[PDB]
Design a protein. Structure first.
Ligand code: GF5
Ligand code: GF5
Lengths: 210, 210
């Protein structure tokens, strides 16, 4: 049985990136799916540290918080830069990704209808820093930080994939982000996972909006 | 000339925790206070990766994102747990602190009048996870994770202090969090910084609400 377990609603959401990470790194794991019927029963929610999912298990280490899981796998799998300075740039990227994801989540779940036009308006100036970071790292030909992939790459990649669904062609303004998505998506294990039923047959969000 | 530069508005805000950390760690740093007016000029802001402050300098290295600063000082000053397992626990704490800080920032800056009592009413359930964490670590007599202070202690302490201003008595039902606040605030270098004008005469937030 795998050392890892992902406990989550039947959605991509805040586990999509860590799932890509494990897949591309060839790690096995178990998915425990939580129905909203189980969730409304209240027992599992009451036992979650912050009342929420994802919950993640690595042996007897139980974690909550999606970016905590991301940094842990990045720590234990060597996806956290080459040295102490790169580690800090990796965080800086991932914190920006988290910032934009929180805006994305706020739109999807609380104001999709009245908010979508302004969000798509503001989107280029939100994506530009990631384009800027790429332009400053090997002219955007490798990864978001340094010369080896990090957990920020997978979280950023997810953030870029789901915005393409929300605002088709939003990467047309960003040649390096665009080639970045195509390049990372083509990694054999990752490509295989993204095409697979366990990824394709889950919706992005739990409320059916995208 | 100290190794560190902090670039921020004349408020505590998202710089209070990292300031407490540097002060308690006996570290020297330079404040570059950015007045709201110069921030309206637009040159500095446009130079910021995410167009936001704080900005932070460590020698040649320039960082953005308050939690990126917190982790970098934690990584470089040894305030990140004794191993990778503790490192994940420190992150889980800090991501919980950040989640509640974002809700605090939302109330302060976008809904203070109509949102306060709903927020105050929900506050106990928001604070209990950190009492629970204390309850599971040496009976709450030491730090939020393990046996050494971490960057998460400083960020959690700030979150607690600003909440006792928002809702006096919000720690009264939590003996371990209340004892923890008193013990951390009694640390000598931290004690002097928290009593100093440079902490006391800054407002908590950029809109004067608290
Ligand atoms: N800081 C946490 C946030 C975790 C979180 O918000 N989880 C939601 C569902 S996930 C987001 C929607 S969607 O996209 O799919 C949840 O558990 N709701 C249950 C309710 O609170 O009872 C993270 O970083 O882990
Ligand atoms: N994820 C970032 C957020 C940094 C951030 O929100 N900075 C704001 C003010 S800071 C909070 C205010 S309050 O608390 O007092 C800013 O710079 N506004 C100027 C405008 O954006 O041009 C990180 O955590 O630092």
């Amino acid at each position: 049985m795998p050392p890892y377990t992902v406990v989550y609603f039947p959605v991509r959401g805040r586990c999509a990136a860590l799932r890509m990470l494990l897949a591309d790194q060839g790690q096995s794991w178990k998915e425990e799916v939580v129905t909203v019927e189980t969730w409304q029963e209240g027992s599992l929610k009451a036992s979650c540290l912050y009342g929420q999912l994802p919950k993640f298990q690595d042996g007897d280490l139980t974690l909550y918080q999606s970016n905590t899981i991301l940094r842990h796998l990045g720590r234990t799998l060597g996806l956290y830069g080459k040295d102490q300075q790169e580690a800090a740039l990796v965080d800086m990227v991932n914190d920006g990704v988290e910032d934009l994801r929180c805006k994305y989540i706020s739109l999807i779940y609380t104001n999709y209808e009245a908010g979508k036009d302004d969000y798509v308006k503001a989107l280029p100036g939100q994506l530009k820093p990631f384009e800027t970071l790429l332009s400053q790292n090997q002219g955007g030909k490798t990864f978001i930080v340094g010369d080896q992939i990090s957990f920020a790459d997978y979280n950023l990649l997810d953030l870029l994939l789901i915005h393409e669904v929300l605002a088709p062609g939003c990467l047309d303004a960003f040649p390096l982000l665009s080639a970045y998505v195509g390049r990372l998506s083509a990694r054999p294990k990752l490509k295989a996972f993204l095409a697979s039923p366990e990824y394709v047959n889950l919706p992005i969000n739990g409320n059916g909006k995208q």
